[PDB]
Design a protein around this ligand. Sequence first.
Ligand SMILES: Cc1cc2nc3c(=O)[nH]c(=O)nc-3n(C[C@H](O)[C@H](O)[C@H](O)COP(=O)(O)OP(=O)(O)OC[C@H]3O[C@@H](n4cnc5c(N)ncnc54)[C@H](O)[C@@H]3O)c2cc1C
Ligand code: HEC
Ligand code: HEC
Ligand code: HEC
Ligand code: HEC
Ligand SMILES: O=C([O-])[C@H](O)C=C([O-])O
Ligand code: NA
Length: 568
Amino acid sequence: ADNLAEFHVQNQECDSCHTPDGELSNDSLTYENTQCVSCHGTLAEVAETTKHEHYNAHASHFPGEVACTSCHSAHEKSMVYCDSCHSFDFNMPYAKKWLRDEPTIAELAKDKSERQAALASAPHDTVDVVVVGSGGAGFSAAISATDSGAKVILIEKEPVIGGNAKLAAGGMNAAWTDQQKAKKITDSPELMFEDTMKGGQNINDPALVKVLSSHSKDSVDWMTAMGADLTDVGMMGGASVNRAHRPTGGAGVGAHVVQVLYDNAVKRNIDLRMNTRGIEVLKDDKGTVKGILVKGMYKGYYWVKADAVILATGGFAKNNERVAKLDPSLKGFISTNQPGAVGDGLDVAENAGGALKDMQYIQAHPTLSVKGGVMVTEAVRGNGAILVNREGKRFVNEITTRDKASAAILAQTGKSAYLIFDDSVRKSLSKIDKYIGLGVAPTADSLVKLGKMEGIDGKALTETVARYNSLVSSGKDTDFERPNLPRALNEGNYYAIEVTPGVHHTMGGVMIDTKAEVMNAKKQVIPGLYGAGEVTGGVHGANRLGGNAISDIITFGRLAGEEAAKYS
Ligand SMILES: Cc1cc2nc3c(=O)[nH]c(=O)nc-3n(C[C@H](O)[C@H](O)[C@H](O)COP(=O)(O)OP(=O)(O)OC[C@H]3O[C@@H](n4cnc5c(N)ncnc54)[C@H](O)[C@@H]3O)c2cc1C
Ligand code: HEC
Ligand code: HEC
Ligand code: HEC
Ligand code: HEC
Ligand SMILES: O=C([O-])[C@H](O)C=C([O-])O
Ligand code: NA
């Protein structure tokens, strides 16, 4: 057969998959997916049948309950979502090459011509608040608004939840938390503010950063009350003390936080709609929002009547064309992001009259795995790893800010470097075992063998580590002034990961005030319109600190949800 449906109808009726009337249930394809599960079992049950030693299409790091139709279409060939960042050896029936070519908001003007008819119709739903995007900002806002008495609809344009937030590794910054105190760490919201302002070249909006620093503990407390583990607290670049919180053992913060938000959303019966793209904010005759029209992938255009809309759509770091127009030094770089992170929500915001700011400030993560084409967490460095070049030498303070680290690596021979660490560092951060399972962390019982394996001068490598270990014991890095020297690299075997910068985060975005209200170029608030998370600009200035984006999206997501509800 040429497609999955044709396969099944060889021995099945249409209503094995469909509703009696044959209409698709909704854009999440709830009923239909329910039918696949009825015959094949849950995604976990399918997973038992498709294991490989180091990977499994049906048991991944994605949180939430991933719908079968995310990858398995019925009446046409479909794409494996994992192929958007990896190239695993898969044999999905009826597969086609991964290719993402979502139309822009501007191109969707080719649907006047569908859109006019929708807007002429009754609104499909009438609620209080509509939140766009199921990343951390969006779930936080949806939950926050719901607890504040508002009826919400949460929409996600992708087939799966979580956006980039589900990918987060290194942690969530906050000061001065109960969790830090339990780990004997001394910190303050003032210190966090100062690290943050300096890290961003004092470009950041000080009122927004004040909100980030002062609400950070509350945000950790809120997530914890909802069931999250934020008890491990690590170091990230440009911070005066350890303040990046994540699950026990040093597991990734991202999938965990989104899973917790998802669970809490489902607990409150929040209306979550997948494959549903926010297209244009609707405003009444006095310019306040009155709703939003959306495009369901399976059921087409419709609008939702509401007093408020919260845009929580993430950044545009996956869109290299737009990035390179803003910062040509990043043209052609690989990105760390999910395939939908291309900035269409910003278009939505601008079309609704919101102004943008700081857009030229785009952050490259200094360590994308060259071999895997995926982000390798900064916590690897925070927990003690060093960087060496092909000459087997250190060349930079590995916990400096990302602008400086990226430039340093790009200035080394071959425009890449190697993370080097031992088993003590490996055991201190369980997320590192994920890089090993991905096959991107070759290992050996001596630095000479490792260097010969990876094309690093082996003798130089050895002396570099011996010398670095001596600075660790002396307590002072006189070579590159790295301010925190947490571990000597001397336990067990040695690992190398080849790394180079990848485009990661867009610090610019829609202009918001401290209540997360979106503003126009005259600095006037657009009543009913809110923005939270990486879609906004002004929080992180010219360079964002590792750990500060998850802090941002919880704090500003929650704040937007409560402001939205109050606005009502
Ligand atoms: C690999 C990786 C690791 C990171 N780790 C860390 C970390 O450890 N600590 C840290 O502080 N930061 C980290 N960052 C950054 C942080 O995760 C992101 O800044 C965060 O994802 C921004 O969250 P958000 O809620 O604003 O957006 P996202 O989580 O990206 O969610 C936005 C969602 O909106 C959807 N969307 C967009 N437009 C539309 C639309 N028009 N209609 C409907 N849906 C829409 C998107 O598909 C997406 O699912 C990491 C980023 C990546 C990529
Ligand atoms: C389950 C394995 C399926 C069987 C067998 C059939 N259909 Fe289906 N259909 C299914 C899904 C999940 C969807 C969504 C799109 C996709 O291809 O994945 C569909 C959709 C259609 C549609 C489109 C309806 C619309 O766009 O509004 C129609 C017209 C349709 N299917 C009809 C249909 C008939 C007549 C079938 C029996 C011969 C049949 N489908 C089987 C899943 C499955
Ligand atoms: C029960 C009534 C089923 C429903 C509803 C769906 N599937 Fe199914 N599927 C079923 C059978 C009995 C078989 C044959 C193998 C077996 O388990 O006995 C299949 C086969 C598939 C396959 C493989 C097709 C191929 O070319 O080999 C896949 C990938 C599969 N089915 C997917 C799938 C999805 C995603 C469903 C819903 C959209 C779905 N199936 C419904 C039985 C049933
Ligand atoms: C993408 C992220 C997927 C989602 C979501 C689901 N499936 Fe899948 N499926 C996917 C791949 C890449 C493959 C191949 C596995 C491999 O290791 O090569 C498959 C395969 C199937 C099959 C065939 C299994 C077999 O008997 O060999 C079935 C029956 C199947 N998938 C079912 C299925 C169902 C019902 C889903 C939802 C619960 C589902 N898959 C999710 C990728 C993806
Ligand atoms: C890009 C946005 C990604 C997509 C889409 C998928 N994964 Fe991923 N994967 C991602 C990263 C950044 C990493 C590095 C390690 C980490 O936890 O951050 C990985 C790694 C894996 C691995 C290795 C570790 C492990 O969990 O076993 C596997 C086997 C893996 N990813 C599988 C996987 C599957 C099956 C996906 C589709 C559902 C999937 N990934 C998509 C980034 C990205
Ligand atoms: O390196 C990390 O884990 C990460 O990528 C952290 C931030 O904030 O973006
Ligand atoms: Na931004």
